[PDB]
């Protein structure tokens, strides 16, 4: 049995994800096109930049995220945006292809496409293995969105002020996820622990990605290809 | 008779323009595409941003521009870039269409296309009349490039330090233009004065455009569509 306040939280996290994730990927025709010197940085910088707006949209509909001081909202988003991106991209990841497939061969991104955007196998080796292990978990829609919301509501991020308040938020989501799995996911006895482990790998992926973003953003010939929101969110301003 | 040092200056200004202006406009397929709410700001912001790199490329080959202190180079470029843009776009302007035609109906920009990028007829009314009057002058290639180089080498810009030095540069280009017209342009007796007038209208167009850029860049929903080089060059940092 989930409480009534528990399935409300699930109902509004699923709806929030549905409003901010467009399985047609038809907006992708508006990015600077893919070129396959780093030939994919314009298209991928545009793809991330767009995804960041979807994550901001999603975050504003998590129960009580809007209630946080506007400094906490920014602090949560600057540190967690890239992890939510990696999490949410699982929805287009394909085990058959070992690539993110977003409708059409021109929006099918192999590992190689991402190296032609600045990144190395030091980030792309763990990132793909994270993607397949998360794909293997075979999460329900309700679990996927719960995990993204738990990721965003982490108190242990640099620059958060109300440690007390948002730890309580994240506590309320973890209990929903534990109850949902046990009650609604048959054979889920170890699923909660595997999910928690996925959060930990995200911190390791974040760290590597931030390293590699730094080196991009320190070379103006590359950083001029980024967008203004990428530079403001992945940037190091306090 | 032009001196030998005079036709050298013409030879290297023409070559500089040819290396930085691609009449195939084939690079245009890499901008965020045109959409015809302001639907043309992504494509046009990309077009200007690319053009700014061409003008930086052109400027670095003007005789002795490279010899200036790197602060003067930046000062000259931040103030004059938009005028050189308006000047150089004359090459794709078409009196038949009243639009800039860059190869294909998808890169044919009417006045309307530019209003769907933030700008008003207060800038687009004088800008088009400047374009046709400059088109009517029927400038030789050597005159076009001389005028762009004279525009860039203006001492009377905010933030220039070596007023003496670059006034002498611009003096040396004006004398080339006067001699070129008289000697090589039949019936050019009034052409130099009309060209000088075109510089004056550029200051009036610059002023209006900077006004309208300010209002764009003060609204984050629009300014996030700009590129990093647009924001750094049209921006007001000293």
């Amino acid at each position: 049995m989930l409480s009534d306040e528990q399935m409300q939280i699930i109902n509004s996290l699923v709806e929030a994800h549905h409003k901010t994730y467009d399985d047609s990927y038809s907006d992708f025709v508006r990015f600077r096109p893919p070129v396959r010197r780093l030939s994919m940085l314009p298209h991928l910088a545009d793809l991330v930049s767009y995804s960041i707006q979807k994550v901001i949209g999603f975050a504003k509909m998590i129960p009580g995220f809007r209630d946080l001081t506007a400094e906490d909202q920014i602090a949560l988003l600057k540190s967690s945006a890239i992890e939510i991106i990696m999490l949410r991209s699982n929805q287009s990841f394909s085990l058959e292809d070992m690539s993110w497939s977003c409708g059409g061969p021109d929006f099918k991104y192999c590992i190689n496409d991402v190296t032609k955007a600045g990144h190395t196998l030091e980030l792309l080796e763990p990132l793909v293995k994270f993607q397949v292990g998360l794909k293997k978990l075979k999460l329900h829609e309700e679990e996927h969105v719960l995990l993204m919301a738990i990721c965003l509501l982490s108190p242990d991020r640099p620059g958060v002020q109300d440690h007390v308040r948002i730890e309580a938020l994240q506590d309320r989501l973890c209990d929903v996820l534990q109850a949902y799995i046990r009650i609604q996911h048959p054979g889920g006895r170890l699923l909660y622990a595997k999910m928690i482990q996925k959060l930990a790998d995200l911190r390791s992926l974040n760290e590597e990605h931030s390293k590699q973003y730094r080196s991009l953003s320190f070379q103006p010939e590359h950083s001029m290809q980024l967008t203004p929101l990428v530079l403001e969110v992945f940037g190091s301003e306090v | 008779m032009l001196s030998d040092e005079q036709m050298q200056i013409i030879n290297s200004l023409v070559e500089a323009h040819h290396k930085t202006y691609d009449d195939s406009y084939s690079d245009f397929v890499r901008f965020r595409p045109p959409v015809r709410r302001l639907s043309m700001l992504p494509h046009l912001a990309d077009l200007v941003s690319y053009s700014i790199q061409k003008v930086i490329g052109f400027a670095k080959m003007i005789p002795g521009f490279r010899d200036l202190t790197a602060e003067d180079q930046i000062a000259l470029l931040k103030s004059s870039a938009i005028e050189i843009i308006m000047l150089r776009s004359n090459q794709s302007f078409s009196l038949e269409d009243m639009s800039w035609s860059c190869g294909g109906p998808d890169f044919k920009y009417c006045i309307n296309d530019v209003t769907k990028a933030g700008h008003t007829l207060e800038l687009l009314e004088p800008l088009v009349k400047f374009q046709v009057g400059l088109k009517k002058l029927k400038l030789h290639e050597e005159e076009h490039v001389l005028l762009m180089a004279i525009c860039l080498l203006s001492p009377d810009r905010p933030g220039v330090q070596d007023h003496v030095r670059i006034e002498a540069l611009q003096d040396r280009l004006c004398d080339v233009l006067q001699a070129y017209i008289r000697i090589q342009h039949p019936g050019g007796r009034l052409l130099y004065a009309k060209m000088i007038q075109k510089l004056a209208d550029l200051r009036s167009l610059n002023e209006e455009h900077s006004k309208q850029y300010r209002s764009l860049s003060f609204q984050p929903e629009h300014s996030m569509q700009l590129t990093p080089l647009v924001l750094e060059v049209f921006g007001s940092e000293v």
Binding site: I56, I74, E232 | -
Partner: peptide, 10 residues
């Protein structure tokens, strides 16, 4: 410093 993020946060 987060001019866009504030806008986006409504």
């Amino acid at each position: 410093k987060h001019k866009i993020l504030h806008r986006l946060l409504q």
